[PDB]
Amino acid sequence: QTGNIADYNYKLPDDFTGCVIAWNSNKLDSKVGGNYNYLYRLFRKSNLKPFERDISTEIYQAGNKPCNGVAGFNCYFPLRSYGFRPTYGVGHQPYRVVV
Amino acid sequence: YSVLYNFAPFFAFKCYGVSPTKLNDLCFTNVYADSFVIRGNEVSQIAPG
C-alpha cells in the first residue's frame, strides 16, 4: 500500500502468506492529554525494502545546503508524534495492530 | 527551488506537508503563490485552526 505508512515505516511484500490482527484500544494507551509515546517517521531519502526496520535520529536533508545540526527552515526532523486523544471519533483512535 | 534559499535567513518554516527535495521528485501542476506584509508580532498566529 502507498501512503504515509507502508512506504516509509513498515512496507509489506507482495507475497506474505499471513495476515494482521487489529482491535480497538482507546483506554489502555489513549490518554486525555495525548499519548506522544507513539510516533511515526514522515520523511525518508528513498523507499523502504519489505520487512526492514529502520531507526535513525538524524535529520533528513531537504535542500541544497547540507543540514548537519540545523533544522526548521530547510530540513525537517523525520519523526512526527501522534495526537492520541479520546475526544476524536473513530478515524483517529489508536488501533493496536499486530501482524 | 535551488534558487529559493539565497534570500536571507528566514523566520518560520513549520510545515504540515511534503519535503522540498521530494517536490523535485514529485511533479506538480498547480500551486498558489500569494504574499502579504504583516507586523512581526502578528505572524505567530498564522496556523491552521
Epitope: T57, G69, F77, L79 | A12
Partner: antibody, heavy 126, light 109 residues
Framework: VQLVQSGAEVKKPGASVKVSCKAS????????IHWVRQAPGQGLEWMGW????????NYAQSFQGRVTMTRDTSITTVYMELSSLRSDDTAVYFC????????????????????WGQGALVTVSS | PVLTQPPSASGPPGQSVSISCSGS????????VYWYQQLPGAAPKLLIY???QRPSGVPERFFGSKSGTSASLAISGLRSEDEVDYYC???????????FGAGTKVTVL
C-alpha cells in the same frame, strides 16, 4: 488544577528529607511529573521524570545514585527523598506536571511544562 | 550543556527590546525551543510552546522564535508584567535531559 505540596524546614546535613506533591482535580493516571530545583540567583536544573501509572524512572547524567523513587497510588501522591545532602543544595523544589505522556528517550522533544507546583525553600544546616 | 545568554537587557517603555539565546549543535537547531517566565517569589509559567504559539491566557503581546543555532524573544510594552526574568529552554542528547538557560533580567528605563 491545583498543585499543593508540603515543604520542609532546616535540617542537619547528611540526613534524609521527605517532600511530597499532591495531585487534585485532574486524573492522576495520564500525566507525567517533573522535578526541578532553583538555587537563589541561579538557573533551573533538570533531574528526571516519573510516570504515575508505572514504575518507570530516569535520572540525569550527574544525579544518579543520590535520588530514589516512591509512589503512592492509593494516596494519589508522589514521594521523593534526598540522601547525602550537600551544602550547595538549598534550592526550592517545584512539582511540575508535563502535558501528555512519554516514557521513551526520544519523546522528550514535544514536552513543555504546562502547570507548576508552588515550592518551599528547604535549606540543610544544623 | 548550559546556554549562553546576556545577564541583563533593558529598554524604555513603548518600544521593543530583544533577548538572544545562543546554543550548540545538539542543544538547539535540531529540536524545539520553549521559554518560561517566573514572578519573583512565585512559580514559573509557560510563555511560548512549539516555537510559535502561546497558551490560553497569554495575549498576542509576547513573541519569540529561532533562526539558526540561536533563538530570539521580543516584547512590546513594559508596564507592569515585563519586569520579571526570562529563561530559555530546549532539549539535547548529550545530557539526555532538559538543559536550561542561565537567566535574563529585564528592567525599565
Amino acid at each position: 488544577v491545583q498543585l499543593v505540596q508540603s515543604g520542609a524546614e532546616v535540617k542537619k546535613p547528611g540526613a534524609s528529607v521527605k517532600v511530597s506533591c499532591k495531585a487534585s482535580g485532574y486524573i492522576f493516571s495520564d500525566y507525567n511529573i517533573h522535578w526541578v530545583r532553583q538555587a537563589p540567583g541561579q538557573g533551573l536544573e533538570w533531574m528526571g521524570w516519573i510516570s504515575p501509572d508505572s514504575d518507570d524512572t530516569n535520572y540525569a547524567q550527574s544525579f544518579q545514585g543520590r535520588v530514589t523513587m516512591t509512589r503512592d497510588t492509593s494516596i494519589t501522591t508522589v514521594y521523593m527523598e534526598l540522601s547525602s545532602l550537600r551544602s550547595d543544595d538549598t534550592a526550592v523544589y517545584f512539582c511540575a506536571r508535563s502535558v501528555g505522556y512519554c516514557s521513551l528517550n526520544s519523546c522528550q522533544r514535544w514536552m513543555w511544562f504546562d502547570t507548576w507546583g508552588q515550592g518551599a525553600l528547604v535549606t540543610v544546616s544544623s | 550543556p548550559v546556554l549562553t545568554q546576556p545577564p541583563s537587557a533593558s529598554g524604555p517603555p513603548g518600544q521593543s527590546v530583544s533577548i538572544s539565546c545562543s546554543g550548540s549543535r545538539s542543544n538547539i537547531g535540531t529540536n524545539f525551543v520553549y521559554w518560561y517566565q517566573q514572578l519573583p517569589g512565585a512559580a514559573p509559567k509557560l510563555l511560548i510552546y512549539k516555537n510559535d504559539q502561546r497558551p490560553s491566557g497569554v495575549p498576542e503581546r509576547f513573541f519569540g522564535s529561532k533562526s539558526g543555532t540561536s533563538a530570539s524573544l521580543a516584547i512590546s510594552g513594559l508596564r507592569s508584567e515585563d519586569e520579571v526574568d526570562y529563561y530559555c529552554a530546549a532539549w539535547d542528547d548529550s545530557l539526555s535531559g532538559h538543559v536550561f538557560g542561565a537567566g535574563t533580567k529585564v528592567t525599565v528605563l
